[PDB]
Amino acid sequence: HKSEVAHRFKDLGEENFKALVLIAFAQYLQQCPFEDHVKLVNEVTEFAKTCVADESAENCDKSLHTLFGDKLCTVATLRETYGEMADCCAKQEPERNECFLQHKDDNPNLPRLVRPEVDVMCTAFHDNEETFLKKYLYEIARRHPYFYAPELLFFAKRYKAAFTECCQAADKAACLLPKLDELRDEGKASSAKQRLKCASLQKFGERAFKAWAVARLSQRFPKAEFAEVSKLVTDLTKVHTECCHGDLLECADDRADLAKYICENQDSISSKLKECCEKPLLEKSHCIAEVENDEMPADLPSLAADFVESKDVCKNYAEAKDVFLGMFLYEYARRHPDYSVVLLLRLAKTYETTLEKCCAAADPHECYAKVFDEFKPLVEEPQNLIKQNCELFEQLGEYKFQNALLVRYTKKVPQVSTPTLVEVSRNLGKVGSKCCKHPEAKRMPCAEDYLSVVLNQLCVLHEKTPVSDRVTKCCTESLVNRRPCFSALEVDETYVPKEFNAETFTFHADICTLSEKERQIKKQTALVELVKHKPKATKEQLKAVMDDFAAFVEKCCKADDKETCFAEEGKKLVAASQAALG
Ligand SMILES: CC(=O)C[C@@H](c1ccccc1)c1c(O)c2ccccc2oc1=O
Ligand SMILES: CCCCCCCCCCCCCC(=O)O
Ligand SMILES: CCCCCCCCCCCCCC(=O)O
Ligand SMILES: CCCCCCCCCCCCCC(=O)O
Ligand SMILES: CCCCCCCCCCCCCC(=O)O
Ligand SMILES: CCCCCCCCCCCCCC(=O)O
Ligand SMILES: CCCCCCCCCCCCCC(=O)O
């Protein structure tokens, strides 16, 4: 149509429009106060209503980039507050927008947002539901310039729902705090996954991305023809390149088109897309990205037909290596929604290496006749880790399971920071309590998903403050070897134990008054330090020292005079404990 703004306003709605415009400005003008953004939002919203009334009104024919760019350049404190960024306003539109992305600071030095008390939140919520949520939408959007805006809006609505419900509860906190903790983690995970997929697309390149996409979409849409999946992998690749670059508008349109495309060809892709394809513009793509795997045809041939036996596998492969490998992935993935994507990538990798070191042999058909026997050990490695770890988690509880990981990883990389080990082991523990509750068929995809963020974050923290070559080795390995690399780490025979420190192992009644979370972290911290001090201790030896500790705590956190107890019974525990640990 003639007016881009009018169009977006129409099929978006005033409410969503105002929220998005807000998120958009907060993502570029990250240093401006809330009240300034609110003002801009009103001016842009007013402008929009105008174009809705008269498609031909002034400026209404200008593109969103142009309009958005002009408003941005309106801010008078631009040069003083943003310096260099102000120089962007001197360029012709095509480059002006390009210039703004380059200055969108991915990580500003804003204060960590603190969670106020439930009572204060709920009261603010009730006094002014809108400015309360917009204020935070603003605080979140400015701290996360790259988070896809629409999704950030999607989260805002879940936050609103949690307040509406919880602030009306007998006991507010019991209802809200957890919903909020769940919202945060999920938000951080969605965030980490977007940065991950973008880093990946940057480091490893387009081929690795498409490979990942083929495998993932084939498990998701096992009934779609391979030509259809290829189509989608192509569009998804363009979509993410554009979304990673940070240009919100281009990004949103490509996603919109794709969502539209999928829905129109819905019956030719999956049966579980009805719901999603009904939903409103703003949610189609998000819904689709998260849709459940469709059901795979029960009448499916044996892979070995076209991939192992069939003479002339090389003829088809040499004719177009990637396509052939792609079909292999497609065929293999849609039959295995229970495999993790990386495992599927590992198989395809293995197969590629084999076709390369076989198609250039006397009797090819016999060189690669095995192949499928190559996969068995690749498939089993991840499955065994899942059963073995989920069983342990079943016996012990999340907490005790975290302590087990704690001991296990401190011994593998003692060089790592204690607080880093504690966090990593804790998040690793959550992955266990989250995924082990699923039936085997969904366990691996689940672990992969959560483990990818956890490992990524682990690596990032290590990128900054390097400590182990082995960690760096794993972290810089190919995406397909990342987790197997970490699983392959063994006890550090090198490590020289930190000599004893009286402080580190001293305790006061503070732990009696502290809440579970802080108490566990206090205990878990001591544990890492314990292992670092005597890394040659046994599950058995440590287990004894740990038990004598559980008691020691109880004994003192209950005794009339707690203070003394922790000092006298403290001297003892430590003295005795050292004796036992030689
Ligand atoms: C996040 C996902 O697992 C699904 C995702 C995707 C990303 C890269 C390669 C394959 C699959 C995904 C989307 O981003 C998406 C965007 C717009 C429309 C449909 C989409 O579907 C997806 O599956
Ligand atoms: C996600 C955008 C919607 C804005 C609503 C957020 C309101 C919750 C405020 C708490 C934020 C502090 C983060 C946390 O620790 O949970
Ligand atoms: C002046 C510019 C303000 C316009 C705001 C950008 C509009 C975003 C459209 C989002 C549509 C959802 C697309 C999707 O992800 O499926
Ligand atoms: C058109 C289909 C494109 C898919 C290409 C198949 C590539 C499979 C090889 C496995 C990739 C492992 C990732 C990597 O090491 O880069
Ligand atoms: C399952 C949670 C417990 C923590 C142990 C994780 C073990 C799962 C490893 C398998 C990861 C699948 C990804 C891959 O194929 O490398
Ligand atoms: C802080 C550095 C410690 C890093 C600990 C390594 C994390 C291991 C992740 C792999 C989980 C699968 C279980 C395993 O094979 O050990
Ligand atoms: C070298 C002697 C110092 C003694 C070390 C004791 C510290 C053990 C902390 C482990 C916490 C037990 C875990 C728990 O059940 O909460």
Curated annotation (Swiss-Prot):
Binding site for (4Z,15Z)-bilirubin IXalpha: 238
InterPro entries the record matches: ALB/AFP/VDB, Serum_albumin-like, Serum_albumin/AFP/Afamin, Serum_albumin_CS, Serum_albumin_N
Residues recorded as bearing Phosphoserine in the entry: 3, 56, 63, 271, 417, 487
Site feature location: Aspirin-acetylated lysine: 197
Site location (Not glycated): 2, 18, 39, 62, 71, 91, 104, 134, 157, 172, 179, 188, 193, 203, 210, 238, 260, 272, 284, 357, 370, 387, 400, 412, 430, 434, 464, 473, 498, 517, 522, 536, 539, 555, 558, 562, 572
Domain of life assignment: Eukaryota
Record PTM text: Glycated in diabetic patients. Phosphorylated by FAM20C in the extracellular medium.
Effect caused by changing residue 568 to K: In Osaka-2/Phnom Phen/albumin B/Verona
Positions annotated as glycosylated: 10, 49, 135, 160, 197, 223, 231, 274, 279, 311, 315-316, 321, 349, 376, 411, 437, 442, 492, 523, 532, 534, 543, 571
Positions annotated to bind Zn(2+): 65, 245, 247
Protein residues bound to Ca(2+) 2: 11, 253, 257
Membrane-spanning intervals of the chain: none
Residues where Ca(2+) 1 binds: 4, 242, 247, 250
Tissues/organs with expression: Plasma.
Pfam family, one: Serum_albumin
Positions carrying N6-succinyllysine: 203, 434, 517, 562
Keyword Repeat annotated: yes
Disulfide bonds: 51-60, 73-89, 88-99, 122-167, 166-175, 198-244, 243-251, 263-277, 276-287, 314-359, 358-367, 390-436, 435-446, 459-475, 474-485, 512-557, 556-565
Modified residues (Phosphothreonine): 81, 418, 420
Mutation effect (residue 80 to K): In Vibo Valentia
Residues recorded as bearing N6-methyllysine in the entry: 532
Domain Albumin: 1-184, 185-377, 378-575
Family: Belongs to the ALB/AFP/VDB family.
Function: Binds water, Ca(2+), Na(+), K(+), fatty acids, hormones, bilirubin and drugs. Its main function is the regulation of the colloidal osmotic pressure of blood. Major zinc transporter in plasma, typically binds about 80% of all plasma zinc. Major calcium and magnesium transporter in plasma, binds approximately 45% of circulating calcium and magnesium in plasma. Potentially has more than two calcium-binding sites and might additionally bind calcium in a non-specific manner.
Associated pathology: Hyperthyroxinemia, familial dysalbuminemic: A disorder characterized by abnormally elevated levels of total serum thyroxine (T4) in euthyroid patients. It is due to abnormal serum albumin that binds T4 with enhanced affinity. Analbuminemia: A rare autosomal recessive disorder manifested by the presence of a very low amount of circulating serum albumin. Affected individuals manifest mild edema, hypotension, fatigue, and, occasionally, lower body lipodystrophy (mainly in adult females). The most common biochemical finding is hyperlipidemia, with a significant increase in the total and LDL cholesterol concentrations, but normal concentrations of HDL cholesterol and triglycerides.
Protein name per Swiss-Prot or TrEMBL: Albumin
Gene: ALB
